[PDB]
Design a protein around this ligand. Structure first.
Ligand SMILES: Nc1ncnc2c1ncn2[C@@H]1O[C@H](CSCC[C@H](N)C(=O)O)[C@@H](O)[C@H]1O
Ligand SMILES: [Ca+2]
Length: 186
């Protein structure tokens, strides 16, 4: 079908050719995640997490659940956090309608991560933070990868890995997300 193919064609032209990520993406009706921007950003961040079916993922910023759905097709289980209640409800509902049942959602504050659920192999954060929430670092399993937009006015996507007990930071490319908001919930 055209739209699925057009989008995948687009991504490859942008330099995104991980067959894994492209298929995950192609399988998802993007237009459905507007029930009640750049699919490139989703592809790039997804690619950076270097996912494998054995990967335990924490996502911050469930939102429409689009990027959630992408993640779920790629790993055995996803844990996702959204601070806006109604958004959590929807996304939760969309995931069941697409028979995606390997996702645990939580209405809460991503700044705190989701400690209860063990260390995570991949951490994806889809809201900008001026500095890396240390809680997330603390929840990053050994050999784990974290992808996060960092900054205020200026923003850069970062990939951080925990290997040999050492955290290593790679600045990837300029972006612009809405802020990771701390404090109470809505
Ligand atoms: N502190 C926080 N903890 C968890 N989610 C937060 C947060 N601050 C903002 N958010 C949420 O992060 C989202 C950014 S939009 C994120 C896009 C989403 N991955 C999608 O595919 O649609 C917004 O829904 C916002 O409500
Ligand atoms: Ca590439």
């Amino acid at each position: 079908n055209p739209k699925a193919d057009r989008l995948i064609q687009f991504l490859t032209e942008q330099g995104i050719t991980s067959p894994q990520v492209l298929a995950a993406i192609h399988a998802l009706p993007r237009e459905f995640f507007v029930a009640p921007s750049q699919p490139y950003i989703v592809a790039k961040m997804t690619e950076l997490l270097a996912l494998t079916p054995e990967t335990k993922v924490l996502e911050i910023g469930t939102g429409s659940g689009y990027q959630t759905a992408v993640l779920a097709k790629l790993v055995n289980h996803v844990f996702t956090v959204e601070r806006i209640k109604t958004l959590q409800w929807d996304a939760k509902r969309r995931l069941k309608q697409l028979d995606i049942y390997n996702v645990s959602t939580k209405h809460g504050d991503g700044w705190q991560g989701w400690p209860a659920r063990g260390p995570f192999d991949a951490i994806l954060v889809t809201a900008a933070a001026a500095k890396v929430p240390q809680s997330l670092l603390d929840q990053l399993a050994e050999g784990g990868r974290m992808v996060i937009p960092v900054g205020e006015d200026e923003q850069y996507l970062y990939k951080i890995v925990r290997q040999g007990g050492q955290f290593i930071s790679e600045r990837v490319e300029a972006v612009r997300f809405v802020p990771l908001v701390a404090g109470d919930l809505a």
